[PDB]
Amino acid sequence: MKRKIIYLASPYGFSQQQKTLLLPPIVRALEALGIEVWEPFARNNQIDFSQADWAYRVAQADLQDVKNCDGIFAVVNGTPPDEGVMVQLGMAIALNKAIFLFRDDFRRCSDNERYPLNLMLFAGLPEIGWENYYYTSVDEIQSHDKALYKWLTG
Amino acid sequence: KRKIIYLASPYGFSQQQKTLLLPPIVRALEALGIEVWEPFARNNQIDFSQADWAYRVAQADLQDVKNCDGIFAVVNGTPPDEGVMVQLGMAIALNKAIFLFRDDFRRCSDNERYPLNLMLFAGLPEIGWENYYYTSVDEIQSHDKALYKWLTG
Amino acid sequence: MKRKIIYLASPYGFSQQQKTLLLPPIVRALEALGIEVWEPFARNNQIDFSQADWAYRVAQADLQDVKNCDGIFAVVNGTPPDEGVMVQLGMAIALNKAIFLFRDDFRRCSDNERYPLNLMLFAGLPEIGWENYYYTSVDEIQSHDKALYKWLTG
Amino acid sequence: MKRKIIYLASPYGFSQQQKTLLLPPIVRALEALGIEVWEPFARNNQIDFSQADWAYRVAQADLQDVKNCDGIFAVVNGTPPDEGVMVQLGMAIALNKAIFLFRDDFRRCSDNERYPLNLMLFAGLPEIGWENYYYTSVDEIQSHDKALYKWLTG
Ligand SMILES: Nc1nc(Cl)nc2c1ncn2[C@@H]1O[C@H](CO)[C@@H](O)[C@@H]1F
Ligand SMILES: Nc1nc(Cl)nc2c1ncn2[C@@H]1O[C@H](CO)[C@@H](O)[C@@H]1F
Ligand SMILES: Nc1nc(Cl)nc2c1ncn2[C@@H]1O[C@H](CO)[C@@H](O)[C@@H]1F
Ligand SMILES: Nc1nc(Cl)nc2c1ncn2[C@@H]1O[C@H](CO)[C@@H](O)[C@@H]1F
Ligand SMILES: [Mg+2]
Ligand SMILES: [Mg+2]
């Protein structure tokens, strides 16, 4: 059937080693669920970075990808989470996309007891049961008891 | 008549920043005839004894961005605040007017065109985005920049 | 009560509003205790930024000032705390300077349950009683029940 | 003769995927030069993390490790660099250890023209030729033309 499209938002493309070693396993786990993965660092591989307007066109391309995804899978590691990822997450919330968060970072960093991060990151998630959309390890992505799988199966 | 600006900032996280940094910016925005929605003030009366206060603040902030006319996002720091970034994103996706403020003199970015991550500028024009980018509090009321022009059609 | 030299390490010089509104109140609070305050953004205001070596000169003068102060007063607001403040805090720890920390940020941001920040920031403070060196408001700075006041009388 | 000891300071132990996949390749790059690698997350994995005082014990062990290493190899990826790495780098500078910086993150984030990061990170490096101590990929670590190799071989 038409594979669901996930926009995989991450800061992992800014580092040589992270792009090479951290992203492929996450892409693989998502694809093992039957997902069509739009990964921005891969999807922008061929830009003419010769050109001065390259940054604006990457921004417009990323904006179109988020508007056309079915859901976002946002890597929100780091203190704080990446600002580009955060802009993409807020776009997804406002457009009623499916929302899934990933953080295998064990530091807690927040102003509230309910959420391990700034509360805005959870605005598009339900009040009760948001943890089902919150993944804390790559091997958890495949879980039939978590929200990504449930969302794929109607 | 007056347009509504959502003033997104991390300045409510420090007692000193909330009292000393925010009022001057609120004053500058109001002196242009803008009705300013400042989230830390607008949620002063939310029951912070309750466990669900974080969810109610998040929905209130989401509703405010949906109902504001523009966002005025304080994007100081390396990197800019993540909640501000989420709210700027809602605003871009909802076709709100967008204005950015950064009086931080550090450059922190992935590109030479823009002083920050290019996603922050996704909702601004390709040419002339700098007219929407304020680098000092006293620049806010400048008649040559985008905020004043936006009020006067 | 002695006139000891405090190096006042902060990121508040990087923002125009912060430099003029947040930093002076902390300078005054320390000076109200009879401290000689070494504030780096003012102390290096007489440097020649016109030529390209100004960053190496400022880095060296900051290093000397930590070498010669009696204690550091590190403003460790932000998520995370400022990296230059962090380097200078590490210099002061290794140099056995007195250590005092300031955080009026409400957000707890940490690896661990003992301390509100990354544990390394506290390596130079006692195992028990470190709270007495940890200041969470401008008003608290002058309290005679906290370590800064007692250090001046020692 | 005793092998030179490098303290490998990084935030990579806070993320399960980063600890597993990013650290081993760097440890191997350093060991292939004959270095004894002190990596803090592994060196403290035997501490009893059920007890409340573990945070203090890790801080003191990290402090002692920096005092007893010959050099530090500081992973300063991220915006900004990790605050614990920064404290450990500051300790290393004040204690006249050899200093080496690693950043394969292509984002530039700084207050100056000369350096790609906050100028304090370079205070322990010479004014001229500091780039020789600054590594931008795992593959560069072994370069016979950069400062680590020269430091090992007199
Ligand atoms: N320079 C950039 N290149 C690419 Cl391919 N993507 C970028 C860039 N800057 C920001 N982004 C986008 O924003 C996030 C990283 O900040 C990613 O989800 C996505 F890559
Ligand atoms: N705790 C918070 N309270 C309020 Cl009223 N707003 C918050 C809170 N945490 C995050 N935010 C929202 O996100 C931004 C700061 O992260 C602000 O624009 C806005 F306040
Ligand atoms: N550009 C800088 N100028 C001065 Cl005077 N000090 C600086 C600069 N960049 C970093 N620092 C120093 O490091 C910290 C800020 O990162 C301060 O404690 C101290 F100011
Ligand atoms: N929880 C921590 N455990 C260990 Cl072993 N080291 C830590 C911890 N938190 C901070 N650090 C130290 O500071 C840096 C990470 O912030 C590392 O160089 C070193 F690990
Ligand atoms: Mg099919
Ligand atoms: Mg299955």
Numbering used by the authors:
A (entry chain B), C (entry chain C), D (entry chain A): 1 to 154
B (entry chain D): 2 to 154
Copy the relevant paper text:
Here, we characterize the structure and function of a thermophilic dNDT, the protein from Chroococcidiopsis thermalis (CtNDT). The reaction catalyzed by dNDT proceeds via a ping-pong mechanism, with the formation of a 2′-deoxyribosyl-enzyme intermediate covalently linked to an active-site glutamate.13 Transglycosylation occurs in a stereospecific manner, preserving the anomeric carbon in the β configuration in the newly formed 2′-deoxyribonucleoside. As with other NDT enzymes, the active site of CtNDT is formed by residues from two monomers, and therefore, it is only fully formed in the dimer/tetramer.
By homology, E88 acts as a nucleophile, forming a glycosidic bond with the donor substrate. Our data show that CtNDTE88A is catalytic inactive, as expected, but CtNDTE88Q retains some catalytic activity, albeit the catalytic efficiency in comparison to the wild type is reduced by almost 50-fold. This residue could be D62, as it is within hydrogen-bonding distance from the C1 of the sugar and E88 (kinetic parameters for mutants are given in Table S4and a discussion on the structure is given below). Enzyme–substrate complex (or enzyme–product complex, depending on the reaction direction): the complex CtNDTE88Q-clofarabine shows the 3′-OH of the arabinofuranosyl sugar within the hydrogen-bonding distance (3.3 Å) of S10.
